[PDB]
Amino acid sequence: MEMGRRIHLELRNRTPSDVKELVLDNSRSNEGKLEGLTDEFEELEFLSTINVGLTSIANLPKLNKLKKLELSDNRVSGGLEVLAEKCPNLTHLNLSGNKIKDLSTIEPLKKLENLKSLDLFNCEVTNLNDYRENVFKLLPQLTYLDGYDRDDKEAPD
Amino acid sequence: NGPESVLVNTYQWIIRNWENVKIQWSQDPTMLYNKMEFEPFQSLVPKAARGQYSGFVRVLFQQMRDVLGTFDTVQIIKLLPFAAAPPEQSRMQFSSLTVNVRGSGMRIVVRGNSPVFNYNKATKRLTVLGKDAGALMEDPDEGTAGV
Amino acid sequence: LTITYSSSMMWEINGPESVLVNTYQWIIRNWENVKIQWSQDPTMLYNKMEFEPFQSLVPKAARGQYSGFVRVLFQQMRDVLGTFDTVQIIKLLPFAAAPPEQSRMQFSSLTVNVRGSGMRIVVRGNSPVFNYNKATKRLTVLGKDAGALMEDPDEGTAGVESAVLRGFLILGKENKRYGPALSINELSNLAKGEKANVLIGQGDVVLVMKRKRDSSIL
Amino acid sequence: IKCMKTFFGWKEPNIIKPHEKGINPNYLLTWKQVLAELQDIKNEEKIPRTKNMKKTSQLKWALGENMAPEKVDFEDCKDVNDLKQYDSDEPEPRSLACWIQSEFNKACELTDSSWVELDEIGEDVAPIEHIASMRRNYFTAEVSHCRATEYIMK
Amino acid sequence: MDVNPTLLFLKVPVQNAISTTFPYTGDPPYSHGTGTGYTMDTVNRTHKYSEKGKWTTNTETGAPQLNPIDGPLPEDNEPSGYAQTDCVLEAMAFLEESHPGIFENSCLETMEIVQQTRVDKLTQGRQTYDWTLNRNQPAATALANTIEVFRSNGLTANESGRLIDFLKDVMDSMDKEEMEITTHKKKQRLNKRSYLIRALTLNTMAIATPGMQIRGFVYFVEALARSICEKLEQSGLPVGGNEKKAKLANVVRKMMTNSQDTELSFTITGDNTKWNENQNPRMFLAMITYITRNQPEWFRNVLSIAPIMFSNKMARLGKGYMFESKSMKLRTQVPAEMLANIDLKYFNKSTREKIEKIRPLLIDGTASLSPGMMMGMFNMLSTVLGVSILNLGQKKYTKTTYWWDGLQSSDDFALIVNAPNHEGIQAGVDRFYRTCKLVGINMSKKKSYINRTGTFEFTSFFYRYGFVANFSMELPSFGVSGINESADMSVGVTVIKNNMINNDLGPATAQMALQLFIKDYRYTYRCHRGDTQIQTRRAFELGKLWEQTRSKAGLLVSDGGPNLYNIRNLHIPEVCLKWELMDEDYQGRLCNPMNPFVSEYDAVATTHSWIPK
Amino acid sequence: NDTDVVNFVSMEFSLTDPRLEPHKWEKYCVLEIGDMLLRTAVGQVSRPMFL
After folding, report:
1. Which of C182, D112, E12, E352 has a CA 20 to 30 Å removed from the CA of E208?
2. R_g of chain B computed on alpha carbons
3. Residues 6+ apart with CB under 8 A from E613
4. Which of residues 75 through 94 in chain B touch C, CB cutoff 8 A?
5. Cα angle at E94 between E92 and E97, to 5 degrees?
6. Could you tell me which chain B residue has the CA closest to the CA of F35?
7. How far is it, in rounded angstroms, from Cα E93 to Cα E391?
8. Separation between Cα atoms, residue D64 and residue D58, nearest integer Å
9. Rounded-to-integer distance, Cα B23 and Cα E188, Å
């Protein structure tokens, strides 16, 4: 399947303004860029893109109600200022399995002051020594890293 | 048989009659709740809290039916067997319904997957306590099985 | 010949065991005034210099978190009422001296460094560091007597004890009717007002209910 | 047994990354044998201190008993085409890989448990004893929560 | 961001963090360096460095011999074993001149011990080659077997119990045409050549262990060498830690402070790796004969027997080799006795080349190695030679503007050379290099460095601006010696105390050693403190004791009492440390002489001291 | 003899995908003997449990 067909199927013959959760699993994107999503989406609250073949999140619209964004099992790498400004209200984020070099590229996520949980897994950044504490220092607003807090306690919903 | 297999048997029985169960829930929830086959499940649930679980799931189903467009089969399948006891009123918002399993309190998370109830959406397959349980009859996100 | 120093700054001379014994001796000897201070303006009590030696024994890495746990537990004990327990107050007071910080851990035992080796004192029940014999009503600290306790004009003699589990109220003997024995870690998922049959420790099961309110500290 | 009983996510074992120069299937068979033997122990009543696995083909093959060369005097094996001195050849060179760096990095991180428990000693009266105790306590408090102690105890 | 401990040196001078570079601080678990190919390479290199030495055929052992002494002087920097007898004798004469009488006093103070030592002195030592059984054996059983065999063969003078008497017995037995060995009844007749080749064997599991006929002479020569070294200042043996630490500082102070400001001083640290290749037993015999000038002839013979015997030493060749056929999945082992005549197709290129080189030496499964030495038998004599070379560096002998001094211990060496200019330093170092080459002393240019005076190292005693960093010892075992409660406690506490005294063990490290000691002792003997919650059978009665006693500190640690040991109080016995605190009834019960259990280390004769079944 | 070699077979649990850096794993045989539910910012996600 392709992006646009998947989005249309998820919409369920409804306007793109009454969706509170969008599931785009095992989809595909051309040129590794986001397609289909537009400004009309303004009620989305729980997004999910897995194995979508996106090179970078460079065409994400302004989902001001986007709170639980997930970009997992993908190869997203590059600047994250687009996520910082387009969706400044992110609360839960997931980048597990992504391609990220070091903290110099994850710094822009500090702009979002509502990020209560940031998840990283099987990445290059996690290889660095004292990765957990260094990220916590870089993101004080964060409270649960990799589903664990600063004192290694599981994070109940 | 034991509780471990009793849970799987109950879920299998529920999913075999999914059409009839769904019709009854949409039209006659009460008689569905008083079904005899649910007797052993409530035996595992502690006798000091079954009423609270039943009331919570019943009010959740009331809210579910009141709203439209948010249908979720997995939640209904997961929480149906808990609605088969005298539903004493309560206000605390439960998040983990205890399930006794051979002297071992096993909880069920209402939202998301749990060890006692694991449903994989990618493969659309349901298993309980690791043991195989079955699968759902669907493919598109509109309520059809013709594909 | 034996020489004794009862002052507040001679305690750290005979050894860490002496420091513990003398801190508890000072607590027990000033039981009335310390109780009144804790009830009225406990903030000044937690700043008392007489507890400085204890802050040394408690590890630096785990003194602020210990202090926060103690402060929250004591706030709960104050705001619940009807479940006073003097032994617990004397046992747990000195750990609150540090400038507490918020934490989620539920400490089942706190560590005191004595002669290098770190002894453990349990928040609930008796410990080798802190033993209390109610048959004779005597407090023993590492085998060295620390004084004698007299119950104050507040007590709950019918179960409930609210200063053992943070955010939870223990309701005495276990009940098989409720959910089977849980784990301390799992308790983080129970909803407000929920009840369980948590296994506190040793070989005894205790029924606990999750506090609906929330006790705050400075 | 108790630690095992805490998990319920058991699947049917299957090989994802096989042992290229070795016996892949017998590893699976011996793992299955381990699980079945643990269940059989569970079915017992008077469990002894330890249980010895019964001799099985897969067990021997995984261990290497059936792959162990036998013993014979040099007189009876001299006339062998490929009878050579043990392979005392310098192992082939291997390039540096980044995974050891990560191994050390994670070995140097701070854990959240008391891995080492040490007994007590006498009191310190001399000032040098005070200095020694201070140094020892500082170092111990520093390293008692490091992964290295976990590896040591394991 | 990524750990990198070496970067610590970017601010901390290396000498401070030298312990960072000692990976093991213990005995590794692989034991790499022993076998057969190593012996092959050792013999090949020993005979290669003597390439131009004269070849001859022995008359008694019937094996070839190589004599490189007085050979052509080396022309290249490669190692040379051409040690000139005249130069060695001149160096020894100069050493005597600078230290008059030294050899005389050594000889006259050692004659008594030569005439006093008993036979049992040979029992102490390392593993020994048992000619009776042809395998490394404990020294005591080897001695018992040797006396039994000699008694059977009618050589019973050693019964007097004197070491010299046993040496004469060994001489007589070696003079006999053939002897009998009776093993249990199997009788073996060893002819003159067979017995001679056996007695001059050097087994290889001090890598090499000689036989028993050569123990006493080696002991005597080493005693003389030690006595000579004692009077020598530059010698690095047999002093301990503090004196060794002071030696470096004293040498640096002598070389630097006295020197003028204009003069420039430099120091070279060098390692004499593979130190036994270029030193021959014949040169040692020459120096021994020089040492005992104008002395009784019997003493000279006793002292010169050792190098004479060693010059005809026979080296055994490992246990053998292991072959494996992957095609048929077969394994076999071949002994060294069949290595003389066997195909070379099995082995690889290097191994077959080594076999080709060493083929013409294997006599009765034992190579012949006249030149070169083996590790750890004549170390003190090597140190004597080194100090002689150093003494040849005074301003009077050098007859030059520069001069030098230093230290040598036969495994490492340090040399301070000072001169008015850089060219003077170069000339001094070059002259020292050549002079030490002439005698056969080899300085490895690939493991030596030169730097301004002040910083260097010697035998791992790293020295920086007056600070020594001794790292010449490993940490011993802090565990249960397995005799009894009091015995184990006493021996171990004494061990930690002694390591603290000399081996330069930090106080805090000693405290953790004592902690681990207490842990292991309690775990092994199941004597845990009464307050602790650990459970065992012995904890029952032990618990009762904890309740009965009125003084917890009085109880012994083995009885469940607290451990009151610390740095201050380590030498005192455990029983005596708790004498007064022990309750009177406990004291009476513990030390009852009428107990049924009882019919070095410092400890009391308590009831806790029993003999294990 | 102290140097006598005893052969054993060791099975160790893990949660690292051995298809990320397979070269690091050459002497090991990897099985997938279960699945584990781990809490993350998007709930309890299932991941393979390797042996």
Report:
1. E352
2. 15
3. none
4. 91-94
5. 115
6. B130
7. 11
8. 10
9. 103
